[PDB]
Amino acid sequence: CGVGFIANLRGKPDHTLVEQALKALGCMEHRGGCSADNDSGDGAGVMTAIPRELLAQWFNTRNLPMPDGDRLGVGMVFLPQEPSAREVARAYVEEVVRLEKLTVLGWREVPVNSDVLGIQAKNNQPHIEQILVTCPEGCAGDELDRRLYIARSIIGKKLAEDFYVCSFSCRTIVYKGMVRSIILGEFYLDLKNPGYTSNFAVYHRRFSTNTMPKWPLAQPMRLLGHNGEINTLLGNINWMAAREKELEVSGWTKAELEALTPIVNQANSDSYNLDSALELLVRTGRSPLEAAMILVPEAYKNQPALKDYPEISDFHDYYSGLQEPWDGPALLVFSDGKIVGAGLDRNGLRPARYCITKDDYIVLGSEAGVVDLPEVDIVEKGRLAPGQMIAVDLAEQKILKNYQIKQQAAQKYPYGEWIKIQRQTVASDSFAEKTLFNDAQTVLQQQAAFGYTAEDVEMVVVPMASQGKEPTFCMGDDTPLAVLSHKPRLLYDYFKQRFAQVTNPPIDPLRENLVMSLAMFLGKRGNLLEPKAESARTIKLRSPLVNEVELQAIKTGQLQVAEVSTLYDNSLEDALTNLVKTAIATVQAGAEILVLTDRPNGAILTENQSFIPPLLAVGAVHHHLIRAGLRLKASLIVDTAQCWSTHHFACLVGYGASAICPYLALESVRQWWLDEKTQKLMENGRLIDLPTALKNYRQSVEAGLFKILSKMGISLLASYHGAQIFEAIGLGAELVEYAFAGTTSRVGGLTIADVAGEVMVFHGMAFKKLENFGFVNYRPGGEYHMNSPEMSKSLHKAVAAYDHYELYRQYLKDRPVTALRDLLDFNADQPAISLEEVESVESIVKRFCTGGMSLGALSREAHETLAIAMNRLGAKSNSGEGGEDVVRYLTLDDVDSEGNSPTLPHLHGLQNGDTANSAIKQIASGRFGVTPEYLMSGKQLEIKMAQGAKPGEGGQLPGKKVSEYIAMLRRSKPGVTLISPPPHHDIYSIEDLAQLIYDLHQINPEAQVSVKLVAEIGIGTIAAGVAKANADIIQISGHDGGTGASPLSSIKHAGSPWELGVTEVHRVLMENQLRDRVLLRADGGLKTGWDVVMAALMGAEEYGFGSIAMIAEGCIMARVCHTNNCPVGVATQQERLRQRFKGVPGQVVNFFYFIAEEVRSLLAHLGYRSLDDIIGRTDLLKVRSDVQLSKTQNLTLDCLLNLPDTKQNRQWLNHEPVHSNGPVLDDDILADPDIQEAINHQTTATKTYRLVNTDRTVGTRLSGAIAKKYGNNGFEGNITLNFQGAAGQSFGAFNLDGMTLHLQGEANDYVGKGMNGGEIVIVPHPQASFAPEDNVIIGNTCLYGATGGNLYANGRAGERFAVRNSVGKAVIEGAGDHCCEYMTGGVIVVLGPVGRNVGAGMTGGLAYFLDEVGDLPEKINPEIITLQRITASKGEEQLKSLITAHVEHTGSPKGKAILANWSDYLGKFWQAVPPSEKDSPEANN
Length: 1485
Ligand SMILES: Cc1cc2nc3c(=O)[nH]c(=O)nc-3n(C[C@H](O)[C@H](O)[C@H](O)COP(=O)(O)O)c2cc1C
Ligand SMILES: *CC(=O)CC[C@H](N)C(=O)O
Ligand SMILES: O=C(O)CCC(=O)C(=O)O
Ligand code: F3S
Fold this sequence. Notes:
By secondary structure, this protein is an alpha/beta fold. The protein has 4 domains: 1-421 and 525-533, Aminohydrolase, N-terminal nucleophile (Ntn) domain (Glutamine Phosphoribosylpyrophosphate, subunit 1, domain 1, 4-Layer Sandwich); 422-470 and 482-524 and 534-776, TIM Barrel (Alpha-Beta Barrel); 471-481 and 777-1222, TIM Barrel (Alpha-Beta Barrel); 1223-1485, Glutamate synthase, alpha subunit, C-terminal domain (Pectate Lyase C-like, 3 Solenoid). 32% of the residues lie in helices and 16% in strands. A 10-stranded mixed sheet has the order 43-44-45-46-47-48-49-50-52-51, sandwiched between helices. Helix 3 (83-99) crosses helix 5 (141-155), helix 33 (1019-1028) crosses helix 35 (1058-1071) and helix 36 crosses helix 39. It is globular and about 95 Å long. Bound molecules: flavin mononucleotide (FMN), 5-OXO-L-norleucine, 2-oxoglutaric acid (AKG) and FE3-S4 cluster. 5-OXO-L-norleucine (ONL) binds at residues 1, 206-208, 226-229, 269-271, 989.
C-alpha cells in the first residue's frame, strides 16, 4: 500500500492540489496490487474537502439556493445495479435522513466512465450517486456531521457490497474504487474537472491479498487511510464489541448511541474497523489525533524525549489501563475536514516522509519524491519517527508538530493526579520461601495429577529455575501431534502459536524490548469515551505471573474479590456449566476480580475429585461473560497447579486471563531446590540459592512471553490478552465454539468428554517418581520418534554399500500414527502399469532439494558433501543463512586418483566434474555473507521468512560455534553468539517483500526467487500476496523441520503440519487464478518416496530434505547440535570433531536413489508415468481403513481431501522460466557502448540521468554484471553514475568497487542495501533553502547487511541506520532510532542528533556521534556498547579522515565547520565501542 496527504494552508482551494494528488497516486502504483485480470486495481481513492464549486452547478441546474460551507451534507453512496433494488435503497437512504429530522435536497449522479475499468471491476461496479442534505433547525459543522454520522451508521445496519456509504459529511468526500492509480481520475470524471477544488487530499493505493475486488474495501474509509496490518484484530474487536451495549457520553442520548451499534465487525477489513472505532472517538468529543493516541498509543515508557512532557506520560499511563493498542505496522493518514494529520504505529514499521514549503504547503506520504514542487521553495524535509504525528489545522492555517499535538491532548485532564489517588500497584520482589506442602509424596502426587511428567520438571522447569532462561534444544518435533498420541497430553498441547510472516513482521524481543510491556490491569475496564477519575481505580500488576505474596496482596486489595472453584466431585461438562454460572452470578453480585482456583479453601486434590483444566476454565468464563454482556466488569486470575511452561502462560492470557498464580510450579521449584540430590550437585558443580531459583523461574517466564508476543509482532501483553494468537489442531467444533470461540481448528478433534478422559489418565497415574515419556529424547519406553538412533544406523549402512534399506523402511512403517499424512492412503483410479513405463530416477531426482542448513550449524565437511552430492544428481542444495566460501563457486580441477582435491582437502570421495557451489543461495534476516558475487553464483535465490522449528524468530548460532572461519564468512566477531533479528528489516509488509524480490530479480535477472513460509492458518492468503509480489517459487515448511538450535517451546508449540499448509496454499492460489505464477515446494519431516507422493498429491512440485540428508551422511540423532559436541562431526565446528566425519557425496547420491526408486513404484501402483501427472491429484487420496485413535473417535480430514478437480486442467503446471522486473533504467545503462567497453576493458566511463521515485534499485543490475565477470574484487575499471532527483527504494543496493554513484536530491528507503564496495554520495540540490544537516535525505534501513563500501550523505537518515552493518563505512548528519542496530564491524560517523536504542545488539566495529545537546548517553542501549570520549589518536585520525572525505565528496557545510574548529568539536564526539574493539588502537590509547 501507499498513502499520503497534501495540504494548501494559505491559498484558495484549487484544482492544482487535486492534480498533484492524482499524480502522487500515480507514483505509488508499484506499491499497489491488481486482481486476476491484471487490470482491475486492489484499490485506490482520494478524500478531499467537499468540492463547493463543483456542486454549485447542481444547485444552478435545479434553480436552487446553495447552502453555505458548513451546512450542506453530502453522502457518497454505492447503490445496487438492479433497477428495483436501487430504488429500494435510494428510498431507505431518504427515509433514514427524514427520520433524523434533516432535509433531502436531491441526488447528484456521479459522472463516470466505466469503459476504463478492468473486467472484474466493471462486473462488480456499484451505481454511484451523491445525496445532498441540510438541517431545517440551522445545524452546521460539528453538530451536523454528528447527525450525519448517526444517520450514516443507521443506513449501515443494512451494509452490503452493493449498499455502502463511503462518506456522509458536511466537510469531506471520498472518491474511491477498484482501480489502478491512473485510472482513478479517468473513471471519476469529477476528478479531472477543473471545477473540483480542495485545500487538502488524502490518497491511498491499496495492495490486497486477493483476486476478488470489493469496492467498499478501497480506501480511504470515512476518516482515515491505512498503510499496514492490525495484528491483534480479534482481541481488539472483542474488547470493543463488549463496550457497545453500554455506551454513555454527556450530550448523547442512548438511542443515538444505539444507532451506531455495529461499531466493530469481524467480517470487515482491519482498516474498516479501525476507521469505524476511530470515528466513534472523534464524534464523541476528541480530535482524530487524540483518538489515534488512544487506539494506537506511542511506546511512551523510558522515552527520554518525554522527560519534559510528563503530562504525556500521564496520558498514556492512564489510558493503557483502559484501551489496549490496535497493534501492527501502521501509517495512518486522517482528515476531519478541520484537521488533516498522520501518525505512526509504536515501532514505526511503515515509512512517512514529508516536505514543507515557504508558504507552509505540505506533502506527506510513504515515499519522498512524489509531488514536484520547485526545490528552491522547500524549507523542510522531515519524516515521522516511531509513534510520531504531524497535522494541519486548516482553519488556523498551522502546521502542528509531534509534541505540541500530544501536549495539547494530555493536558486536558489531571491524569497523573487520578492515577496517584485511584491506582493500586501490586508488586513484590520477594517470594514465599516457606513451602506449601510439608511431606514428600504430596508434591509428587499433585504433580502427577496435574499432568506433570518427568521431562516437564527435569527439562523445562529445572533449567528455567537454575539458569534463568527457557531451555534451548535442537532438531525438530519428531513425535505425534497431541491428538494422535497414545501418550497422555495437556489441553495446551492442542494449541499451536501463530506468528507473523510477510504481511506484517515479528519484532525483536531482546534488541527492542524497550517497546514491550508485560503490565496488566485488574478490574472494571472503565468508560473509554468519557475520562473520569473512577476509570483509574484499578489494580496494576507489573507482570502476569503472580507469586504467593502478590496474590495475598491482591486478595487484601482495594477491590472486591471472589474465589471460584474449578474442582468438582457429575461430569466435567456439567462441572463447567456450574462454573460459568457461578462466574456470571458472582460478577453480577459485584466482584471485580475472580480467582479461578483449583485449590479452594486452601485444600488439595483428592482421588474423589477432578478439575477443569485451566485453559478450558478461562476460555469458558471469558466467552460466557462476553455472551452475558459482563466481561468489562471483572478480570480473571487463574490460580492453578496446571501451568508451568512458557507456552502455558501464553495460552492462558491469550484466552482471557489477566494473571496467573502457578502455585504448584513455584512449589516444584521449591522442592527441586530443597532435596539432597540437587544440593549434592550444587556443591560439586552443577550451578544458587532459593530466592534466586524462584527469581530465575519468573525471569524465564517473562522472557518467554516477550518471545511469544514478538513472533506475532505484538508489543504489549494487554493487546495479546484478548487476541487468540493460536491455531488449534485436534479440537472438535462444539468445544472450540464453547471455550475458544473464533479459533481455527481444521481437523475436528476432541469433544468435552474426550478432554475428561485425558485428565482421568493422569488421575489414574496419581491415585514413586514421575513417569518419563520419550517426548524430548528417544527412549525405549517412550513416545514415538521418527528419527531414532537405530533408524539412522541402518539407513547409514544401506547407503554405505551402493537388504539394509529394509529395516530402515520397516522401522518407518511399524510406526504409530504420527503425522496427518499417516491417516491417509491411496485409492487409485487407473489400473497399475509396469515399472519400466515410469519416468527415470534421474528425472525424479531433479525435483529434490537439500534444504538450507547454515554453514555455521553444520561443519564445512557436512555442508560441502551435500552440495557435491546434489549437484551430481542434477538437483539443488541450499547454502543456508551463513553465507558461502567463494572457493566453492568454481568447478573442481585437481581431483587426484584417490579422489582428493587440494582445493577441498578435508573432503573425500571426489571426481573431476564436481562442485560444491550451492545452487540455492539464501537471503535471511541476518544477511550474513550476502554479497553480489554470492548472489550471482546462485541458480536460485531464496528469501527465508521462517523455518518450521521457530517461526516467530531469527536464526540462532551460539558463540561456541562461531570459529574464526565462520566469523570470516559472516564478517563478524569470532567468539560471539549470533541471534539474527526476527524480521527482515527490509520487509514490514507485502509491498516491501515485492521490493526485495524486485532487488533480487534486479541483480540477477536469470535467477528464480523463492519465498520460504511456515504452515499456519492464513498462509493461503499470504501466499496469494507472495505470488502477486512476483515470486517464482513458494516453499512451505512444516512445524516439523529440524534446526541446529531453537527454543524447546518453539520446537514443540509454534507452527502447523505442512499438510494443512501445502493444501491451503495450493487451493487459495488455484481458486484465485494465481497457481501458475509459482512452483510450490514443501519440507518438514520428509523421508520417504511415500512422503514425496503424499506431498505431490496435495500440491507440492518439489521436495525438501534436511534432517534425513544429515542422517544419510552420518548424523545419528544424538541431538546435541546446539552444543558444538556433535560426536560424528556433522553439526560442530571443533576441528578434532570435524575430523571424525566420514562421509562422501556418493552415500547421499545413493540415498536420493532409494527415495526416487520408491517414487517410481508408487507411480506404478497408481498407473501414471510421472509426478507431473499426479501433482495436485487429491481425489487419489482416501482415509486409512485400519486406524484407531486413543483420544477421540476420529478426526475429520475434509480440508485435506477437498481440493479443486485437477483431472482435466493441468495448465497451472506451466511456469514462466523467470519473472521479469519489466523495463528498467539499468538496462539503458548496460546497452550503452561506453558502459559495455568500461566493463570489458576495465576502463573509465561516466553517465548522468534524471531519476524519479519509480526508479528503484538503480546501480544494482550493473553490479551484478560486473560481479558476474569479475566477482566482488576483480574489476579494475571505474564507472561513475550521476543522478538528479528523488531515488526510489534500494538506491545503490549491492554496490561494487569501481562503482561511484552520485545523487543530487534525496533517496527513499534501503540506500546501499548489501553494499559491498565503491562509493555512494547523496547531496541536496545546491539551490536548497535549508541547512542540509537538519533535514532528511535518506530513509530507513540504509546499509542493511553491508559488507564493504563508503556512503556519504549530506542530510539525515531514518531508523535502523547501518542495521546489520558488517564492513560498511558511512558519514551521515543525523538519524532516527536504532542506529547501528546489529553492527559487527565497519565504521559509522553521525554528525548530528540520533534517536533512542543506539547500538542495540552492536557487537563489533566503531561508531562516532557528534553530541551538541548532551543527552546521547540517555539514548544508548546499554547492553553491549560503552561510550567514551576519544582519547586514542588513531581513533581521532579515523574520524577526521572520514569527515575529510565526506567534505570532499559532498561539500557539507557541517563537515567543513567541524574541520575548521577541530579541537572545539573533538571533545563533543562520543565513540561507541563494543567489548571486542576495546583493545583496538582506535579505541585505546
Ligand atoms: C542443522 C539444521 C540447520 C538448519 N538451518 C537453517 C537455516 O540456515 N536456514 C533455513 O532456512 N532453514 C534451516 N533449517 C531448516 C531446514 O532448512 C529445513 O527447512 C528443514 O530441516 C526441513 O525439515 P526436516 O529437517 O524434517 O527435513 C535447518 C535445519 C537443520 C537440521
Ligand atoms: C496495503 C496495506 O497496508 C493493506 C491495508 C489494509 N489491511 C487493507 O486494506 O486490507
Ligand atoms: O547459522 C544461523 O545463523 C542459524 C541456523 C539456524 O537458525 C538453525 O540451526 O535452525
Ligand atoms: S543430531 Fe546433531 S548433534 Fe550430530 S548426530 Fe545429528 S548432527
